[PDB]
Structures are given as structure tokens and as C-alpha cells.
Amino acid sequence: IEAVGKKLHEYNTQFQEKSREYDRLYEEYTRTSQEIQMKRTAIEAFNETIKIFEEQCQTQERYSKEYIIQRIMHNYDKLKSRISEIIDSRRRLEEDLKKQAAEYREIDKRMNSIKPDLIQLRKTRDQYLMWKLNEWLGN
């Protein structure tokens, strides 16, 4: 070794400290995407469900009103009280979602920032290749 010595080897194990951090940052990235789409189809599920519970308390309108013992009662009191728990369930889902988006965009950011750096340290190894034969690779 003459000019820049075996200093190009400490550059290689360090190279993996990000080459693998890519892989690990990527699966986190890939995972989180489905995670989101799960949440997103969940909300439509919520929607049509919410949508259904109105169609019910509005059935016992002109159908229950056609009399007004009288205590055909506590049913309606709670049919509202459940709707509350659903709208707030969906509400909770919603905020969990855009956080995961803000997360998704973050995971995207740091990946579209390593990539070029990871690639700029790729060929510095490959160019200076000529600098038993083969021994430097192992460790």
C-alpha cells in the first residue's frame, strides 16, 4: 500500500453501518405503508357502520311516533350513546393515521437522503480494487 493505505477498509465496515441501516430503514418503511392502508380501509368500515346506525333510530321515528306501557324507551337513549363511542373511535383512528403518515414521510425523508451518500461510497471501493491474491475482503 502506497498512497491512501488500508484506510479504505475501515471505510467498508462503516459502509455497512448504513448499507444495513438502509435495509432496516426500508422494511420499517415498507411495513408502515400497509399499516396505513389498513387504517384507511378501517375508516370506511367505520363510515358505513356509522352510516347504518342512523338508518335505525330514524326507522323508529314515524314507526314509533304512531302512538305518541309508554316506556318503549331506554333503547333510543342508548342507540345515541353508542354512536358517540363509534364517532370517537373513528376520531381516534383518524389522528393515529396522519401521525403514521407524518411518520411515513419521515421514514421516506431519511431514506431519500442516505441513498446517494450510500451510493457515493459504493464505487470508491470498486474503482480502487487493485490496491494467494484476495485477502482484504474477509475482515
Partner: protein, 997 residues
């Protein structure tokens, strides 16, 4: 598969959103038409007919009940977690089985009064997507496809009814046959009485009794001849004159047909007996075939169905150089450091690159990105080939120093013009190196992420042009401006990724007309065209029109990403229609499915080919369904495949019902294995198995997992679960070892108790491909007469990283063999009892045959494994059967990143015990010969494997992106070298790894 590749030596001649598993008791909110919500406490395994009867028992408590109708006048409906509303007609259905989201049911009367029309939209279930998410796509291509495809469906259904009973029987139960009638001469000699002994059975129940009748008959003796000779035997009597006999073995010859005992095969087609795969396997394996006489009545009785319904200006004559307006992407992700930027790189593409493509002015490296540019690409408009594509991406590197694609033409032939919004795909995984045309990305709005807005040139109503105008490019070749050995059909014999010189492209194009004589050069010729000249291309279209046909092996190359042209592909498809047989079709069915990804438009020639066979040959239908369903989670292909699946399901017939059993069954498995893998069920084997068995005992499981067919081979019925024999193979992601009684009339009787691993974890796809390639090699070998014996066990991917693997009985890893027997501190490799292990099992003249098997198989793998550069083999990759045979499992990691199977001393000893080394024994000499013949044989058929791999580029598989990955296999098989040249190379690699040539 039939036996367990076991030779007989010297025989001679329940859910809810968020929750995995609903409590054994939940409260379900029932909702009635009177407005009153009741809350019923249901057992999770209860039928809807039981919950309904309850609801209407509880109704008389709840006022306004005077408004409630007859029980048998209503239907339950709810929101499923696929976010849909579903009328629950099949009230047999268990609570836990109706995918459910929130624990509620809502009563209503059967609206849509076509009960039977909505039933059938089951299908979404088999598809894994509601058949109504289609009933809503704007894209007319889609709506057209669904409509225009049913021709094939109508065609197929006809081609089955035409011939009334037999035809169906033959649709279902296709004959399972090798595609050569000629029988290898190393098989013929295991025969060498010239012929074979079979045992044909007759059941005479309710006397239960089964009677054998052993015949020693011709190997090529068709099944009708076998039924005859069998009825001769049974009926021969001291009371029948031979004349009287002959008119009986007649007046009931053909009331019967043949059936493999124990599974569901049926020889129903005039073929040499030995051309059926069952018989040929019985030979190789040293087994006496057992077949059954089945009354046609009792076959033809089994088969119902026959049900099918279906409830639904100018030209290239333009004088301007193509421009495309790039507006604005609305989203990105990063915020500046130094030499970082953003710009929309654009290209015009036909497979790979016409025209010097264009990166548009780099402006604002972050803040809301406008470009408002026009992009002049340096080709004419009339020069654009049908299927030319806009390729774009955004990514940047280091400007100073240190993604989406679009069909330029509609499926309509119309040139694309005006406003377009293009949601972009997240960049792949081993990609920024490019701009990415390979991308399925062809025709591709996504969902809500980065979105480019576009503007295409506009000049009054534009389309492509009937082959009328096209053919009329005779004009060009009648241009003779004569002011200016042929030994080059060597380069037909040249692997597809050989990469050819511009100098050669010119040459081939020059002598283009002198290839309609050497037709197999077509691929190379097609590569030679400058595709950005409407002139060369239109001439091409015309050669192609009446080009001579080509072998499906070669004719497949024209279906990969490199040949994206309706005219090229049509010929290709017409080669496959011409002579690619149901046998070899299901060998290459994976690739043929994958290729569909680069097919530009939904409606097209290849799909219609495939769909039709799949609808004709139920054995193909099965894997066609499964290979497509497997990838429905992948949104780049979902819509295409979903749509393909719907047509298929709507026409396959009774089979649909079978497939759902299959699908319900796999749903249960995927949910169970999940619990164990996740839901903090990282407790202990003992606890887990507790759970495993409690769960499979519940009647929902019992029902789902018992009367179905093996997705690995539907001939194999799967009856009742052995249960005692079921275990979490734990020792991984938690794979399940499952055990089913084989409900066959001659079940244990005559051949098996059925076994299979379900694994929820690994991506099975690569394994799947490599097992496929092993089979293919094994086929090259057997035909060429050069007998080596691989064991490509079953392996089916059924969804995202989920699948079934075939169990092979009486087989062990070398490690197992090593632990079974021995004390000491050293290993000894049980070099003894891995040979002594083989001396036992195989005592006697059996031994020689077992050493042979080992030797064969060992050599087989040794090559296959080097060629494909797989895993890297140790003692828990390598498996031996009592039988003698060696075989590799868990290949895993594909095409390398050299010499994965290093022959340890253990294996050398097995090639009969030699003292100080066994590097030079005549047993080992014999062996080396085989390898050199094996490698040299696969060498001879290299282009095939290049293709197979190449056709397989459209698939996630991190192991296969680029053609340069297939390069490895190009190296390993010898790059430029001669046969006798490369033979040397292989040896150099044998010696380098072994330390002893």
C-alpha cells in the same frame, strides 16, 4: 407425491376488526326494522339460523314486536372488515366466519330478489375482494374487459358441454400425462420383459369386498385394452365358451374407466399406459400400479354444474416532433443539504430506449415544485411504435459533483392527449441507478402520494391505423438505390442476454429476408430494429405476419419485457396455441402468469389464451387460480389479476365451490398461525400446542379444515384431521405440520395418509421457482436417457409470504442421521451411520441399488446446485431417505451474490467405502462421468433457463431485478467458450472447492 418418492429396491420383473379471535361469547347488537336495537349474547361458533331463531324468541319481549314479520322473511346484513355491506344469505355461516369488524347484525328483507345472483358474488371471497369494487371503476378499459372477456368464458363452457358427459369428466380430471409417447430407454430396461405388471381392482360392496386381478400387459397398451384384459380375467369361467366370453368383454367393456387407487386421477384418454405420469412413476419407483374399474355411471354421477350467466378519427399523419408538458408534482420528502436537487427525468421507451431522453430544467430543490415546461423529444410523431411509453422519475444525485410510466397509446389505438394526473410509485430497493422502465409501472395511477400533472399535445382526434396502411410499406423495400460467407446463423445458437454489437444489428436487419428460412433467429432480428423508424418497423410487422412457427420454448422469449409489441406477441401467443401442450403449459404456467404483467393492456391475446385453457383443463384452472390469488395483495397487479380472477371464477363451474373450501381453510390457518406468531404467544411449545389443539377442536375449525382438496395437488382429497398427528413444527416462524386421513375408497388401502406443512413467514416464491427449475433439469435428463433423480417436492405460495410445502416421509437431514447413533466427543460424521445408516435399511443386494440412487441424486443436485448457485449447503439442508436418495431442501437464496454443494467426506464414503481417501475409486469415476454429462446436458439447453428466469423479472423477488442477475447463470454455464472448453471450466470449479480434482 404418489408414494413418497420411495423406491422398492429389487422388486424386479374466527375474527373481528382489531381482534384475532372473538371471545367464546360476545355481545352482538341486533338491529330490527322497528328501530329497536337488542343486544344478544352469542357463542362465537353459532350459525345465523341459531342466532336468528334466538332474536325472534327474544323479540316477544321487545315492544313494537307487533310490527315484526315471520322469522323466515328476513336476512342479516353487516359491515365486513373489507369495509363492505353484505347480505348474509348462507345462514349456515358461523358468526366467527363472517368477516365482521364490529359485533353487529342488522335485519332486513331479501331485497334484490335475485338471491341466486348475489350468492354467486361469493367469488369476491375466492378473489379476496368484493365483486363490486369493480362495479365502480371509472376507467372504461376495466369495464370493457369484464364485458368483452366473457366470449372466452362462453367459448370454454361450450367446449365442455359439446360431448355432454365425457367432455366435462375430461375438463375436470384431465389425463395426467408426460408429453412424449416415446419412453426413455433406461426406464424401458427396468421393464425389460418389454412390458409391465398391473393390478386392476373391482369393488363389490356393500359386501365391501375388493378383488384384485393381476395382468402382465404391454407398456403401451391403452386403457380400453386394459379394461378389456381385466374383464376377460374376472369373467373367464368353465361355463363360458371363449366365443361366449368375447361377447361379454364387450357388451360391457366401456361401461367402465380407470382410476389411480387412493387419489383422484382418471385415465380417460387413448394413450400408451406408460405415457401417464402415474405409470411411469410406478416403473422408476419399482411399484406395481393399482388401478380401479369405475362405473362411468358412478363417475358421471359425481359431476354437476353447466351454470353460466353474465349480468352486465385521424392517423399518425402528423407533422410535429413530440413534446410533453410537465407541470408540477405536489409532494416530495426532503429539505436541502448541499449538492441536492429535484427534476423530472423523462424518457420515451419501447422496452429499452428510443431517442435521447430528457431531464427537465432543475428548479426549486424543495419548496412547492413547479416546472411549467414543455419537453421536445427528438423523434417524429409518425415514427412512434405502438406501445411506446413515457418513462419518468424525480430522484436526484449530485448535479455539480461530490417514479412512473405511461402508455403513449390507449388500449383503443388512440394517441394520448391533454390533461393527465399521475400518482407515482415509491422507488424500489436496488434502484436509483435507473429511471426504471421494467416497471409494471406501465399504465399506473397508484394511490394518494407524489402526483405529477401532465399535458400532451393536441391536434383534432388521433388514433393508430389498420394493418391496411401498415402492410402498404411495400413502398420501402421497392426502393433500390444501387450506388454502393453468410456464416452468421451461428448466432441463432446464442443465449438471449448475449448482448449484440450495433455492427451485427445492421447485418441481421440487412439479410432480414433470409431468416424466414431460419425462423428461430427472429428474437435477435427483433432486437436489431431501430424501433424509432415507422419504416423498418412496418416492414417487420409484415415478416411477422407470415413468419414460420417456432418452438414454445423459444417462442416464450417474445413474452418478456424486451418484446412489448402487439404484433410480436400475437405470433408468440399463436406459437403457444400452435404447439405448447397442456403438459408443458403447466410446467411453465408460473412464467406465463408473470409475463402478463408487461402486457400493456388488460384485454389482449395472451390473457385470452391462458384464461381459455384454465377454463378447459381444470388441473390448469387450479394453479392459474392459485398463482394469481397468491399475488392479490400486491397493488401494482391486484386490479389486473382480480379482474382476471373474476372472469375465471364466474365460469370455472362447480370448481368454484371447491376453491372456496380451499380458501376458507387457508384463511383459518393464516389466522391461527398469526396468533402463535404474534399476540404474545411467544410462550412455550407445551402451552402453544395446548392452544393449537383446543382451537382445532372448535366446530368452526373442524368444519373449515376437513372436507377439502390439497392446493398442492387437488387429486389428493383431505378428509378428517388426524389431530393427534398435528404439531407446531415450531422451530421457526411457527409452521404447522398437518395430518389428514385420505378419504379415498381405497385410501390406506393401496397408498396413503395425507401430510403437509403450512408456513406463515417465509416468502415461498423463490423456493417455488427453484424447485420448478429442478424439475425442468430432471426432465432434460430423463429424456436424454441420462438418469439422475431429483426430488422437487410440492411448494405453493398462496398469498403474501404464506404457503404449503409437501412433506416427504422417511427422510432426514444429515444432522439427524448423525445424531441418530454415536457417543464420543468427536463427530465421526457417523461416516459409519451415514452409510451404515444406509447399510441398515438397505441390507442385501438392495444395498447396491441404494448406493446407486444416492450416487445419481447426489450428482444431480451437485450440478443443479452449482449451475443455479444457491443457498450454500450444510448438514441441515441436505436430506437422505431410507430408500437411498439424496435431496436438497430450503434453497432459500437463489442466484448467489460459488459452489454451494461441497461434497464432504461423508458423501464420498457412501460412494462405497474406500480407505485412504476415495478421490480415486471406480465408483467415483462412474460418478464424475454423470456430472459432466449432467452439466453438459443442461448446457445444451441453456437458452430455456435464461428465458424462464427472464420471464420471471416482473415479480418482487429481490433476487431477480435486471437481466444482469441472470448473468450469473450465464457465467456458470460457460460464457463464450466451447462445450469441451467449458467442461474444463466446471472441473476447475470442482477442484477449487474440493482440494482434489
Amino acid at each position: 407425491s404418489y408414494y413418497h418418492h420411495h423406491h422398492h429396491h429389487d422388486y424386479d420383473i374466527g375474527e373481528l376488526w382489531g381482534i384475532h379471535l372473538m371471545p367464546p361469547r360476545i355481545l352482538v347488537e341486533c338491529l330490527l326494522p322497528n328501530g329497536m336495537i337488542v343486544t344478544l349474547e352469542c357463542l362465537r361458533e353459532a350459525t345465523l339460523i341459531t342466532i336468528k331463531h334466538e332474536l325472534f324468541k327474544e323479540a316477544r319481549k321487545y315492544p313494537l314486536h307487533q310490527l315484526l314479520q315471520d322469522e323466515s322473511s328476513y336476512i342479516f346484513v353487516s359491515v365486513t372488515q373489507e369495509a363492505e355491506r353484505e347480505e348474509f344469505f348462507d345462514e349456515t355461516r358461523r358468526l366467527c366466519d363472517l368477516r365482521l369488524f364490529q359485533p353487529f347484525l342488522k335485519v332486513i328483507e331479501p331485497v334484490g330478489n335475485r338471491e341466486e345472483k348475489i350468492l354467486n358474488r361469493e367469488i369476491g371471497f375466492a378473489i379476496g375482494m368484493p365483486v363490486c369494487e369493480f362495479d365502480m371503476v371509472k376507467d372504461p378499459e376495466v369495464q370493457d374487459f369484464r364485458r368483452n372477456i366473457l366470449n372466452v368464458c362462453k367459448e370454454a363452457v361450450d367446449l365442455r358441454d359439446l360431448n355432454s358427459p365425457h367432455s366435462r369428466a375430461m375438463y375436470v380430471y384431465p389425463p395426467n400425462v408426460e408429453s412424449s409417447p416415446e419412453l426413455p430407454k433406461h426406464i424401458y430396461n427396468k421393464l425389460d420383459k418389454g412390458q409391465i405388471i398391473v393390478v386392476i381392482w373391482v369393488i363389490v360392496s356393500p359386501n365391501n369386498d375388493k378383488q384384485k386381478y393381476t395382468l402382465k400387459i404391454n407398456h403401451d397398451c391403452v386403457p380400453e385394452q386394459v379394461i378389456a384384459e381385466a374383464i376377460r380375467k374376472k369373467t373367464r369361467s368353465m361355463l363360458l365358451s371363449s366365443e361366449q366370453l368375447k361377447l361379454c368383454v364387450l357388451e360391457y367393456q366401456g361401461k367402465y374407466i380407470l382410476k389411480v387407487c387412493g387419489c383422484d386421477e382418471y385415465f380417460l384418454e387413448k394413450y400408451p399406459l406408460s405415457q401417464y405420469k402415474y405409470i411411469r412413476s410406478c416403473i422408476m419407483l419399482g411399484r406395481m400400479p393399482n388401478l380401479m374399474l369405475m362405473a362411468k355411471e358412478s363417475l358421471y354421477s359425481q359431476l354437476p354444474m353447466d351454470c353460466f350467466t353474465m349480468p352486465s378519427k385521424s392517423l399518425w399523419v402528423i407533422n410535429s416532433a413530440l413534446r410533453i408538458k410537465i407541470l408540477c408534482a405536489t409532494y416530495v420528502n426532503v429539505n436541502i443539504r448541499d449538492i441536492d436537487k429535484i427534476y423530472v427525468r423523462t424518457g420515451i421507451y419501447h422496452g429499452g430506449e428510443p431517442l435521447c431522453d430528457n431531464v427537465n430544467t432543475q428548479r426549486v430543490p424543495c419548496s412547492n415544485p413547479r416546472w411549467n415546461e414543455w419537453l421536445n423529444y427528438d423523434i417524429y410523431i409518425p415514427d412512434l411504435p405502438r406501445a411506446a411509453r413515457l418513462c419518468l422519475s424525480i430522484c436526484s444525485v449530485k448535479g455539480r459533483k461530490g417514479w412512473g410510466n405511461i402508455n403513449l397509446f390507449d388500449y383503443t389505438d388512440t394517441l394520448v392527449s391533454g390533461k393527465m394526473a399521475l400518482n407515482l410509485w415509491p422507488v424500489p430497493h436496488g434502484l436509483e441507478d435507473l429511471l426504471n422502465p421494467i416497471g409494471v409501472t406501465g399504465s399506473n395511477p397508484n394511490k394518494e402520494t407524489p402526483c405529477l400533472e401532465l399535458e400532451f399535445d393536441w391536434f383534432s382526434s388521433v388514433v393508430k391505423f389498420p394493418d391496411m396502411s401498415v402492410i402498404e410499406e411495400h413502398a420501402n423495400w421497392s426502393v433500390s438505390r444501387e450506388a454502393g460467407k453468410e456464416q452468421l446463423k451461428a448466432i441463432s445458437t446464442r443465449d438471449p442476454l448475449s448482448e449484440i454489437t450495433e455492427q451485427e444489428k445492421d447485418f441481421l436487419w440487412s439479410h432480414r429476408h433470409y431468416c424466414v428460412t431460419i425462423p428461430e433467429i427472429l428474437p435477435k432480428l427483433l432486437l436489431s430494429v431501430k424501433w424509432n423508424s415507422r419504416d423498418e418497423v412496418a416492414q417487420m410487422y409484415c415478416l411477422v405476419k407470415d413468419w414460420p412457427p417456432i418452438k414454445p420454448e423459444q417462442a416464450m422469449e417474445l413474452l418478456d419485457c424486451n418484446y412489448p409489441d402487439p404484433m410480436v406477441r400475437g405470433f408468440a401467443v399463436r406459437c403457444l396455441e400452435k404447439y405448447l401442450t397442456d403438459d408443458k403449459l403447466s410446467q411453465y404456467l408460473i412464467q406465463l402468469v408473470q409475463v402478463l404483467k408487461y402486457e400493456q393492456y388488460l384485454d389482449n391475446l395472451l390473457v385470452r389464451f391462458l384464461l381459455k385453457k384454465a377454463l378447459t383443463n381444470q388441473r390448469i384452472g387450479h394453479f392459474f387460480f392459485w398463482h394469481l390469488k397468491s399475488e392479490m395483495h400486491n397493488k401494482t397487479v391486484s386490479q389486473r389479476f382480480g379482474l382476471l380472477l373474476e372472469s375465471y371464477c364466474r365460469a370455472c363451474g362447480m370448481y368454484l365451490k371447491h376453491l372456496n373450501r380451499q380458501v376458507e381453510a387457508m384463511e383459518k390457518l393464516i389466522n391461527l398461525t398469526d396468533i402463535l406468531k404474534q399476540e404474545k404467544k411467544d410462550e412455550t411449545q407445551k402451552v402453544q400446542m395446548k392452544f393449537l389443539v383446543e382451537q382445532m377442536r372448535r366446530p368452526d375449525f373442524m368444519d373449515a379444515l376437513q372436507g377439502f382438496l390439497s392446493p398442492l395437488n387437488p387429486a389428493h382429497q383431505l378428509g378428517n384431521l388426524r389431530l393427534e398427528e398435528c404439531r407446531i413444527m415450531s422451530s421457526a416462524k411457527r409452521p404447522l405440520w398437518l395430518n389428514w386421513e385420505n378419504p379415498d375408497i381405497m385410501s390406506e388401502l393401496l397408498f396413503q395418509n395425507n401430510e403437509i406443512i403450512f408456513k406463515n413467514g417465509d416468502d415461498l416464491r423463490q423456493d417455488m421457482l427453484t424447485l420448478q427449475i429442478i424439475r425442468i433439469m430432471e426432465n432434460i435428463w430423463q429424456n436424454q436417457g441420462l438418469d439422475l433423480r431429483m426430488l422437487p417436492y410440492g411448494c405453493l405460495s398462496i398469498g403474501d409470504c404464506v404457503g404449503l410445502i409437501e412433506v416427504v416421509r422417511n427422510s432426514h437431514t444429515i444432522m439427524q442421521i448423525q445424531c441418530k447413533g454415536g457417543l464420543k466427543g468427536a463427530l465421526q460424521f457417523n461416516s459409519h451411520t451415514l452409510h451404515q445408516w444406509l447399510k441398515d435399511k438397505n441390507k442385501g443386494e438392495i444395498y447396491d441399488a441404494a448406493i446407486d440412487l444416492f450416487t445419481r441424486s447426489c450428482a444431480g443436485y451437485c450440478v443443479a446446485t452449482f449451475i443455479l448457485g444457491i443457498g450454500d449447503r450444510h448438514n441441515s439442508n441436505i436430506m437422505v431417505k431410507d430408500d437411498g436418495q439424496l435431496f436438497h431442501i430450503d434453497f432459500g437464496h437463489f442466484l448467489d451474490h460459488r459452489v454451494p454443494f461441497v461434497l464432504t467426506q461423508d458423501f464420498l464414503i457412501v460412494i462405497s467405502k474406500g480407505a485412504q481417501e476415495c478421490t480415486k475409486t471406480r465408483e467415483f469415476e462412474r460418478f464424475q462421468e454423470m456430472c459432466y454429462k449432467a452439466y453438459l446436458a443442461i448446457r445444451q439447453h441453456a437458452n430455456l433457463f435464461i428465458n424462464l428466469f427472464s420471464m420471471m423479472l416482473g415479480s418482487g423477488m429481490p433476487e431477480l431485478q435486471s437481466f444482469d442477475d441472470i448473468a450469473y447463470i450465464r457465467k456458470t454455464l460457460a460464457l463464450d467458450k466451447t462445450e469441451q472448453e467449458a467442461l474444463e471450466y466446471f472441473m476447475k470449479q470442482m477442484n477449487d472447492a474440493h482440494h482434489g480434482g
